[PDB]
Design a protein around this ligand. Sequence first.
Ligand SMILES: NC(=O)C1=CN([C@@H]2O[C@H](COP(=O)(O)OP(=O)(O)OC[C@H]3O[C@@H](n4cnc5c(N)ncnc54)[C@H](OP(=O)(O)O)[C@@H]3O)[C@@H](O)[C@H]2O)C=CC1
Ligand SMILES: CCc1nc(N)nc(N)c1C#C[C@@H](C)c1cc(OC)cc(-c2ccncc2)c1
Length: 157
Amino acid sequence: TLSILVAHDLQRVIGFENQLPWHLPNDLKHVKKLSTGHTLVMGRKTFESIGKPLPNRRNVVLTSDTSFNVEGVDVIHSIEDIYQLPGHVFIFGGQTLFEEMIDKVDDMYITVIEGKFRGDTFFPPYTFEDWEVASSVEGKLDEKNTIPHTFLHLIRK
Ligand SMILES: NC(=O)C1=CN([C@@H]2O[C@H](COP(=O)(O)OP(=O)(O)OC[C@H]3O[C@@H](n4cnc5c(N)ncnc54)[C@H](OP(=O)(O)O)[C@@H]3O)[C@@H](O)[C@H]2O)C=CC1
Ligand SMILES: CCc1nc(N)nc(N)c1C#C[C@@H](C)c1cc(OC)cc(-c2ccncc2)c1
């Protein structure tokens, strides 16, 4: 299974100056629950913005840099290498990897952040004409999660 995992706003903003524009604990839990025990594939800039692998799953980084070798991270150098990865693989960002992979994935786990933020990186445009809504669940608002948000699971038709 090859999936996209992404959070984007009403205009498909995903990032700003190598950071997420929002702070949403419910979304991090969501990500943990989905990917624990599986594989995350991410671009080099995305990895460096956090700088540490996420524990309890395989962390894979795509980069042209043949000197890359981080403790607890696996490296690949070609998009083609993604297909050799075993198990459930989640394309985890950022913009460049999303653009490269959106036409190739089976399904998408999207957190729609119902706001308009300033961004410099975007999720590519897509149409529901090509994607069936397997599920759509509103996030609960509270003290620490104060932006409305919706978890979508979309499956390519
Ligand atoms: N809201 C969300 O769900 C998410 C948001 N983000 C955000 O996205 C932004 C970063 O996106 P972006 O700038 O596009 O960077 P990326 O994370 O997509 O990294 C780009 C780098 O990945 C490597 N790479 C990509 N494709 C290839 C390839 N085909 N072959 C070899 N290497 C490749 C290259 O590394 P190299 O230059 O070393 O060769 C390239 O420079 C940040 O703001 C981040 O916060 C990221 C993930 C999720
Ligand atoms: C969650 C934000 C998020 N939400 C959703 N729905 N999809 C995503 N793909 C991401 C994401 C992401 C990237 C920036 C990312 C990569 C990473 O590579 C290790 C670690 C984290 C991370 C480690 C720990 N705490 C917060 C974030 C985030």
